[PDB]
Symmetry: none
Subunit: 35 residues, 4 copies
């Protein structure tokens, strides 16, 4: 994803996302239809 699209999809910075638990980073990608 572009920076703009990552923001649009997840609503947080890449750094914040990378700090979430691994289960949640699973959940969010599934919730947003990315894999």
């Amino acid at each position: 994803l572009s920076d703009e699209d990552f923001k649009a999809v997840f609503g947080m910075t890449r750094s914040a996302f990378a700090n979430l638990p691994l289960w949640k980073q699973x959940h969010l990608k599934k919730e947003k239809g990315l894999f």
Copy 2:
């Protein structure tokens, strides 16, 4: 937890829980604050 307490806490049998993705079985355990 005993099987009966597991049902009371998670709202499903262990066999059903086992058929959830491992990231979801992460989510639910964390939502209940348990193991």
Copy 3:
């Protein structure tokens, strides 16, 4: 349900709902026909 529609149906966010005891989260879903 979307977070938007969840709040419209249950009168609270998923975060708040997740804090209710399971028997009550039973009650509410059964009362709305969404079990």
Copy 4:
């Protein structure tokens, strides 16, 4: 890691992990700081 801790963290069983290439099993450990 115990098998239980492994599958909770990696989101897959040790058996599932073993299916992946050796360089990928490198990536998946190092991504979590677990090598």
